Amino acid sequence: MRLILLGAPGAGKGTQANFIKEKFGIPQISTGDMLRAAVKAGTPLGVEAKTYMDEGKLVPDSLIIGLVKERLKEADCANGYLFDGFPRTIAQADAMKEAGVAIDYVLEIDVPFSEIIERMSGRRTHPASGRTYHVKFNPPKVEGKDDVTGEPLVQRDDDKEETVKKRLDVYEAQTKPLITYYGDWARRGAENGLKAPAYRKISG
């Protein structure tokens, strides 16, 4: 199993990642973890990456991909691997191809945006007790009040409908080019000696 896993924020990718990695005994690979491990281990690419990070600068694609190639050489990738939230751009996708990183499937977690927005933004809590409510699925008996105490209910700023929608929009514009990139390649055939990954919407 050699996988890219794509999922919108709030779509529950983290737990699905965990399910998939457990089932095939393949490691979850993300750029954050790769950078930190490489930096901590004083690897040559890690020291180089740190020169950018110390300065609040973008670590360049050339370097991330270099960390990827070393990462995939490790023992734990012998049965395969799961990219979580990488690639993010078509140039990264294309760098991975040109670097010879094999990918069998692009799996896109399938959970409609309206369900995500609905799920998160209707949430309310009573902070003193931790009691939760949902404006739709578990409404308080009196709007904006805790059933037990009568005290005010709150909504997290991160959960506000338009904050959530803005996160999905960004994800969407990041992800669509990646799906197109891989779909077009799969219709063209093998490149750099690699087959395009097969696209699956998994719901799943």
Swiss-Prot record:
SUPFAM superfamilies in the record: P-loop containing nucleoside triphosphate hydrolases (SSF52540)
One Pfam family this sequence matches: ADK
Binding site for AMP: T31, R36, K57, L58, V59, G85, F86, P87, R88, Q92, R156, R167
Keywords, sorted A to Z: ATP-binding, Cytoplasm, Kinase, Nucleotide biosynthesis, Nucleotide-binding, Transferase
Record region (LID): 122-159
Domain of life of the native organism: Bacteria
InterPro entries recorded: Adenyl_kin_sub, Adenylat/UMP-CMP_kin, Adenylat_kinase_CS, Adenylate_kinase_lid-dom, P-loop_NTPase
Binding site for ATP: G10, A11, G12, K13, G14, T15, R123, T132, Y133
Pathway participation: Purine metabolism; AMP biosynthesis via salvage pathway; AMP from ADP: step 1/1
Biological-process GO terms, alphabetical: AMP salvage
Subunit text: Monomer.
Family classification: Belongs to the adenylate kinase family.
Biological role stated in the UniProt entry: Catalyzes the reversible transfer of the terminal phosphate group between ATP and AMP. Plays an important role in cellular energy homeostasis and in adenine nucleotide metabolism.
Domain remark text: Consists of three domains, a large central CORE domain and two small peripheral domains, NMPbind and LID, which undergo movements during catalysis. The LID domain closes over the site of phosphoryl transfer upon ATP binding. Assembling and dissambling the active center during each catalytic cycle provides an effective means to prevent ATP hydrolysis.
Name of the protein described by the UniProt record: Adenylate kinase
Native source organism of the sequence: Burkholderia pseudomallei (strain 1710b)
Species classification: Bacteria, Pseudomonadati, Pseudomonadota, Betaproteobacteria, Burkholderiales
Gene that this sequence comes from: adk
